[PDB]
Ligand binder design. Structure first.
Ligand SMILES: O[C@H](c1ccccc1)[C@H]1CCCN1c1ncnc2[nH]ccc12
Ligand SMILES: [Cl-]
Length: 167
């Protein structure tokens, strides 16, 4: 039993809810919140900008030190950093940004990072401003993640389409 509330169950291990991931994180304080990161951990917009704003820029400060030490992530890769005031940990995961020409096949590799954590709150990778089809992203999620994932979809109109079209 966990404290996630109001999710629709899609499969044995995947759940979904129309919700602002920032507001969800502040309520649940999950062990792991997933950020829709880029390789530079520059949290400018989308989910990343919103999560960072909610940490009063502490996420960005920590991220800049991470990059200075380690260099950029790989597309499809991840790192674990602090969750600050939102969660115990933040798993920064880089899905391909179609608007940069990045290989959509890397979306499965990106979701594989979730399997290193038993329970996660997360957005649909590569969706929104990353330019991929959110319906496709949900399919890859369900077919790749085996751990328990609670998906927050910000756009209510998009949420309804994802549910109604889910196979
Ligand atoms: O799939 C969502 C989406 C939202 C709008 C249009 C298309 C897709 C992702 C991708 C872009 C942002 N987003 C979010 N998801 C959950 N919580 C969020 N808080 C702030 C942003 C955000
Ligand atoms: Cl985003």
């Amino acid at each position: 039993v966990n404290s996630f509330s109001g999710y629709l169950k899609l499969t044995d291990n995947v759940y979904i809810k129309n919700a602002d991931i920032v507001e969800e994180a502040k309520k649940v304080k999950p062990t792991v919140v997933v950020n829709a990161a880029n390789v530079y951990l520059k949290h400018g917009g989308g989910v990343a900008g919103a999560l960072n704003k909610a940490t009063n820029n502490a996420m960005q400060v920590e991220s800049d030190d991470y990059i200075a030490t380690n260099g950029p992530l790989k597309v499809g890769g991840s790192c674990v950093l602090s969750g600050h005031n939102l969660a115990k940990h933040c798993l920064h995961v880089v899905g391909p940004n179609v608007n940069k020409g990045e290989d959509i096949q890397l979306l499965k590799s990106a979701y594989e990072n979730f399997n290193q954590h038993e329970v996660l709150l997360a957005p649909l990778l590569s969706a929104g401003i990353f330019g991929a089809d959110p319906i496709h992203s949900l399919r890859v999620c369900v077919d790749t993640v085996r751990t328990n994932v609670y998906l927050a979809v910000f756009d209510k109109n998009l949420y309804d389409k994802l549910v109604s079209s889910f196979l």
